[PDB]
Amino acid sequence: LSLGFTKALMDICDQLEKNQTKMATYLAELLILNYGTHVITSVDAGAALV
Amino acid sequence: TELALFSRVNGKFSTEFQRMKTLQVKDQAVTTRVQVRNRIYTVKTTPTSE
C-alpha cells in the first residue's frame, strides 16, 4: 500500500484504540471520500472514436 | 392599317408597342457553427497534502 493509505489506516486504528467511535467514523468517511470506494486492479489501455 | 382609294391614293399606318420587364431576386443565407471542446488531463490533489 502507498504511504498515504497506510497513514490513513494508522490514524483510524489509533483513533479506534482511544475508544472513540465518533472520530473513527468521521475518519472512515474521510477515507472513503479521499480514496474512493472500490480499488481498481485492472484497466484496459485503449482508445475510441465516434 | 392600309387604305387605298380610287387605286391612286394609298395610306399606310403601322404602329408597334413592345414592353419587356424582367425582375429577379436572389437571397442566400449561409450559417456555420464549429465547436471544439478538449480535455487532456484531470489533475487532482493528493490526500496527503499540506
Curated annotation (Swiss-Prot), chain B:
Induction comment: By CSF1 in fetal liver macrophages. By interferon-alpha, by interferon-beta, by interferon-gamma and by bacterial infection with E.coli and M.smegmatis in embryonic fibroblasts.
Origin: domain of life: Eukaryota
Subcellular location(s) per record: Cytoplasmic vesicle membrane
Modification after translation: Proteolytically processed in two steps to generate the Macrophage-expressed gene 1 protein, processed form: cleaved by trypsin in proximity of the helical transmembrane domain releases the ectodomain into the lysosomal lumen to orient the pore-forming domain toward the endogenous membranes, and processed by the asparagine endopeptidase (LGMN). Proteolytic processing in antigen-containing vesicles is pH-dependent. Monoubiquitinated in response to bacterial infection; ubiquitination is required for vesicular localization and antibacterial activity and can be blocked by bacterial cell cycle inhibiting factor (cif).
Chain's role: Pore-forming protein involved in both innate and adaptive immunity. Plays a central role in antigen cross-presentation in dendritic cells by forming a pore in antigen-containing compartments, thereby promoting delivery of antigens for cross-presentation. Also involved in innate immune response following bacterial infection; shows antibacterial activity against a wide spectrum of Gram-positive, Gram-negative and acid-fast bacteria.
Similarity-based family: Belongs to the MPEG1 family.
Quaternary organization: Homooligomer; predominantly forms a homooligomeric arc-shaped pore complex instead of complete rings of 16 subunits.
Domain writeup: The MACPF domain includes the central machinery of pore formation: acidification causes a significant structural rearrangement, leading to oligomerization and deployment of the transmembrane beta-strands (named TMH1 and TMH2) that enter the membrane as amphipathic beta-hairpins.
Protein's recorded name: Macrophage-expressed gene 1 protein
Gene name of the record: Mpeg1
